[PDB]
């Protein structure tokens, strides 16, 4: 696309600048360009891709939730009719969010996942796939909602199976996957008990492996463990 | 509160 | 443009939704559409226009300053050569910022200012004109920089002359104009003494008129007075 | 510090 004429290394360099500038839409466009060069991504480059799109979609999700809350108050008893505008604007934001999710899913399908053989890369991309189907599920209503939820579940489950076989229980990628799959269970799949069990099991298995870690790896792992604990505290 | 997912 | 088919009232309604959603680019696009209907703007509508573009340009200014700081470190002794990318990306952000400023200035010229007869509206728009030329001056280097600075100055001065004749010294529009013109003097025009004198005089004349005000107007005026004091504290 | 201009 518009990045086709820019060097791969320059796209990555500019993604890093955009991050520093808090220009996340630019960051995401640079990283899309880098992916579309066709080469596999390094660990650092995967992280840049993730950060860029997570920030873009996160802003959209936050706006969607504000608009949805105004829309659902408009649809209460005793609410004055104010016309189509709230729905139309919610729809506009929703369609943009869906477009971003579709963009990310398209990068994963063409061709990041199929070229990813190492557990670090494959788990990362499958977790991403689950996340972006999860964001689609948050706004889905209507006939494909079940299928979207199933797509998220399937991606997460494939990532889980690989991570349990190939990574230690403290690996930050494995931990973040488990965190996000637990969120899926609680918030999307109407399975709070599964969410709680996964978070508990994950936390406890990681605890038991901390003794193997350097000081720096310990800090990395315990940061995510704390998030599992924060959700457990919220959910119980 | 909404649940916390993995941060950047 | 893209808003030509939307009702004026719907554009305003959606600008308010976009503000709630922190969707300032959308907000600005809705308000541009509303302006381009050709009718004069109410006080509330002027404020929406201002808020939208101030937030858009403010994000651009912040990003520009981050990029400029990285660029000027690259141009120090002992800095490794890293290629054209920093300059190119700074230029990209700068060009976008300039485009937003040009958009606002174009709305003012076609035809908000010429239709504005009341002091509240005219002062507001002339202050806006000064502000957006000021933002252009922040990034200007090269042959028109003087002319851009002079355009800012001229707009501010016309606004000042009207405000002193037609508004009380506590009027929040008058106060904000004086605040921003003082910033122009200090940061753009290399005139710190003029900045300090304007802020002092403005503050003191407002103080002397507070006794005339209701509790609510008092709160409005004193909020801006405090900003004048904060700058005086910084500059002395 | 940069100088403060009028807020929203
Ligand atoms: Cl809309
Ligand atoms: Cl660029
Ligand atoms: Mg090449
Ligand atoms: Mg829809
Ligand atoms: Mg139970
Ligand atoms: Mg009409
Ligand atoms: Mg330039
Ligand atoms: Mg002196």
* Tokens of residue C108, six digits: 């003012």
Q: Tell me how far apart the alpha carbons of residues A86 and A68 are, in angstroms, rounded to a whole number.
A: 8
Q: Nearest CA of chain B to the CA of A172: how many Å?
A: 10
- Please state the φ and ψ torsions of residue D7, each to the nearest 5 degrees: -85, 170
The reply to whether residue A180 touches residue B6, judged by beta carbons under 8 angstroms, is: yes
Cβ contacts (< 8 Å) between C88 and chain A: which residues? 14
* Tokens of residue A40, six digits: 């596999």
- CB distance A63 to C22 below 8 Å: yes
What residues have their beta carbon closer than 5 A to ion ligand 7?
A: C 94
Kindly give, in sequence order, each residue whose CB lies less than 8 Å from that of residue A73, ignoring residues fewer than 6 positions away.
A79
Q: Nearest CA of chain D to the CA of C39: how many Å?
A: 23
Cβ contacts (< 8 Å) between D2 and chain C: which residues? 187
Q: Is residue A142 left, alpha or beta, with left meaning phi > 0 and alpha meaning psi from -120 to 50?
A: left
Select the residue of A175, A177, A231 nearest B4 (Cβ to Cβ). A231
Distance A24 CA to ligand 1 centre (A): 23
Q: Tell me how far apart the alpha carbons of residues C52 and C25 are, in angstroms, rounded to a whole number.
A: 7
CA separation (Å) from C79 to A8, A14, C83, C84? Answer: 23, 18, 12, 14
Which method was used? Answer: X-ray
Q: Do chains A and C touch (3 or more CB pairs under 8 A)?
A: yes
Residue D2, SS3? coil
Q: Would you list the DSSP string of C51-103? A: HHHHHHHHHHHHHHHHHHHHHHHHTSTTPPP--SHHHHHHHHHHHHHHHHHHH
Q: Which chains touch D (3 or more CB pairs under 8 A)?
A: C
- Expressed in angstroms, the distance from the first to the final Cα of chain B is 20
Cβ contacts (< 8 Å) between C187 and chain D: which residues? 2-3
- CB distance C69 to C90 below 8 Å: no
Distance D5 CA to ligand 5 centre (A): 55
Angle at A157 between CA A155 and CA A162, to 5 degrees: 100
Distance C62 CA to ligand 8 centre (A): 31
Q: Please check whether residue C13 touches A, CB under 8 A.
A: yes
Q: Tell me how far apart the alpha carbons of residues C47 and C45 are, in angstroms, rounded to a whole number.
A: 5
Distance A98 CA to ligand 2 centre (A): 26
- The DSSP 8-state label assigned to residue A39 in this structure reads P
Give the total number of structural domains in chain A.
1
- CB distance C192 to C186 below 8 Å: yes
Counting ligands in written order, the one closest to the CA of A67 is 1
The resolution, in Å, is 1.1
For residue A170, give the H/E element and its range: none
Distance A85 CA to ligand 1 centre (A): 7
- CB distance A112 to A136 below 8 Å: no
Q: Do chains C and B touch (3 or more CB pairs under 8 A)?
A: no
Burial class (CB in 10 A: 0-12, 13-18, 19+), A159: buried
Q: Tell me how far apart the alpha carbons of residues C133 and C155 are, in angstroms, rounded to a whole number.
A: 9
Q: Nearest CA of chain D to the CA of C132: how many Å?
A: 13
* Tokens of residue C196, six digits: 């300090």
- CB distance A214 to A163 below 8 Å: no
Chains A–C, number of C-beta pairs less than 8 Å apart: 58
Domain of residue C32, residue span: 1-236
Q: Tell me how far apart the alpha carbons of residues C17 and A82 are, in angstroms, rounded to a whole number.
A: 13
The reply to whether residue A17 touches residue C83, judged by beta carbons under 8 angstroms, is: no
The reply to whether residue A93 touches residue C67, judged by beta carbons under 8 angstroms, is: no
Counting ligands in written order, the one closest to the CA of A96 is 4
Q: Nearest CA of chain B to the CA of A27: how many Å?
A: 14
Q: Please check whether residue A66 touches C, CB under 8 A.
A: yes
The reply to whether residue C179 touches residue D2, judged by beta carbons under 8 angstroms, is: no
**C-alpha A230, offset from chain centre:** 19
R_g of chain A, CA atoms, integer Å: 19
CB atoms within 10 A of CB A27: 25
Q: What is the CATH number of the domain that holds A146?
A: 1.20.190.20
For residue A236, give the H/E element and its range: none
Q: Tell me how far apart the alpha carbons of residues C84 and A162 are, in angstroms, rounded to a whole number.
A: 42
Helix axes A8-20, C85-107, angle to 10 degrees: 60
Q: Which chains touch A (3 or more CB pairs under 8 A)?
A: B, C
Q: Tell me how far apart the alpha carbons of residues C87 and C95 are, in angstroms, rounded to a whole number.
A: 12
The reply to whether residue A227 touches residue B8, judged by beta carbons under 8 angstroms, is: no
R_g of chain B, CA atoms, integer Å: 7
């Amino acid at each position: 696309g518009a990045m086709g004429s820019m060097e791969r290394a320059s796209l990555i360099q500019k993604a890093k600048l955009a991050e520093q500038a808090e220009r996340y839409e630019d960051m995401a466009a640079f990283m899309k360009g880098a992916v579309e060069k066709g080469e596999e991504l390094s660990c650092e480059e995967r992280n840049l891709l993730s950060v860029a799109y997570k920030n873009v979609v996160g802003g959209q999700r936050a706006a969607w939730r504000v608009l949805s809350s105004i829309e659902q108050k408009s649809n209460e008893e005793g609410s004055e009719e104010k016309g189509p505008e709230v729905r139309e604007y919610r729809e506009k934001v929703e369609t943009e969010l869906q477009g971003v999710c579709d963009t990310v899913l398209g990068l994963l399908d063409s061709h990041l996942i199929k070229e990813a053989g190492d557990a670090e890369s494959r788990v990362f991309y499958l977790k991403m796939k689950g996340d972006y189907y999860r964001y689609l599920a948050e706004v889905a209503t209507g006939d494909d909602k079940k299928r979207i939820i199933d797509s998220a579940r399937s991606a997460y489950q494939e990532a889980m199976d690989i991570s349990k076989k190939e990574m230690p229980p403290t690996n930050p990628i494995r931990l973040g996957l488990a965190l996000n799959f637990s969120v899926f269970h609680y918030e999307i799949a109407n399975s709070p008990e599964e969410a709680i069990s996964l978070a508990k099991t994950t936390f406890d298995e990681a605890m038991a492996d901390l003794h193997t870690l350097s000081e720096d790896s310990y800090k990395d792992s315990t940061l995510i463990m704390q998030l599992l604990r924060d959700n457990l505290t919220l959910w119980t | 509160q909404r649940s916390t997912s993995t941060p950047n």
